[PDB]
């Protein structure tokens, strides 16, 4: 399948795409403002993620640091990213359908549209100034708005036991982005698409 990753923001991002234990395609790439990067993801992938990283440095070989979303210091992510990271999430060709979501469960850093480029299903977006509003205790020095599980490590915020409810903080993300997951047991805002759809991830969409 095809993912076209478009930086519509006015600042450079370093896009990332991983499943957790391996890169997807090249695993990451600088995107200056306006730059598009199309990747290939295998049918049937489960639990894929696409995110932005901000304020990175990488040297000639590719090792470095980013202030949000860092994946073990690699330009080319083979693992997931340090919060706060807004997340595009997907598992493809499940049993005849792909399923797409955007998640604020690791926080928010960059506004995002995740829309299908082929018919049948609707996209999802979170574009609100979450970082401009972000509750004071959830702010990340380095940039972004952390989730409460990251800042406080409690069973309730982290839904450790498989039981939890919404919180003042989950609800701060759900007031600003009802279509994105705001905590682990949120009512799902997942989208079911035909198997083998293609997609566009747009950062800063409304930019």
* Major sheet size, sense and barrel closure: 6 strands, antiparallel
Could you give the count of β-strands? 13
| Helix content percent band | under 10%
Q: How many helical stretches?
A: 4
User: Which word captures the global form?
Assistant: globular
**SSE topology string:** EEEEEEEEEEEHHHHEE
Query: What Rg, in angstroms, do the CA atoms define?
Result: 16 Å
Assembly category = monomer
Structure classification:
mainly beta
Across the major sheet, the strand order is 3-2-5-8-9-12
Number of domains: 1
| Beta-strand content estimate | 25-35%
Give the N-to-C terminal Cα separation: 27 Å
Q: Would you kindly provide a written description of the structure presented here, covering whatever features stand out?
A:
- By secondary structure, this protein is mainly beta.
- It has one domain.
- The protein is 10% helix and 35% strand.
- It has four helices and 13 strands.
- It has helices at residues 130-133, 148-152, 155-158, 168-174, and strands spanning 2-7, 13-18, 23-31, 36-40, 48-51, 54-58, 64-68, 87-94, 97-103, 112-116, 124-126, 191-194, 199-203.
- The strands form three sheets. Strands 3-2-5-8-9-12 form a six-stranded antiparallel beta sheet, with no helix packed on it. Strands 4-1-13-10-11 form a five-stranded mixed beta sheet, with no helix packed on it.
- A hairpin with a 4-residue loop joins strand 2 and strand 3 (23-31).
- It is globular and about 40 Å long.
């Amino acid at each position: 399948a095809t993912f076209e990753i478009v930086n519509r923001c006015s600042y450079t991002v370093w896009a990332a795409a991983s499943k957790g234990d391996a890169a997807l395609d090249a695993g990451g790439r600088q995107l200056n403002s306006g730059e598009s990067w199309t990747i290939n993801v295998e049918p049937g992938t489960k639990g894929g993620k696409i995110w932005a990283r901000t304020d990175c440095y990488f040297d000639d070989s590719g090792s470095g640091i980013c202030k949000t979303g860092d994946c073990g210091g690699l330009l080319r992510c083979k693992r997931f990213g340090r919060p706060p990271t807004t997340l595009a999430e997907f598992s493809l060709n499940q049993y005849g359908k792909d399923y797409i979501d955007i998640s604020n469960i690791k926080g928010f850093n960059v506004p995002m549209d995740f829309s299908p480029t082929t018919r049948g299903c609707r996209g999802v977006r979170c574009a609100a100034d979450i970082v401009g509003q972000c509750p004071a205790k959830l702010k990340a020095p380095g940039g972004g708005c952390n989730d409460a599980c990251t800042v406080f490590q409690t069973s309730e915020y982290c839904c450790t036991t498989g039981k939890c409810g919404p919180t003042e903080y989950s609800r701060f993300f759900k007031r600003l982005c009802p279509d994105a997951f705001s905590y682990v047991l949120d009512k799902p805002t997942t989208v079911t698409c035909p198997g083998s759809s293609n997609y566009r991830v747009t950062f800063c969409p409304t930019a």
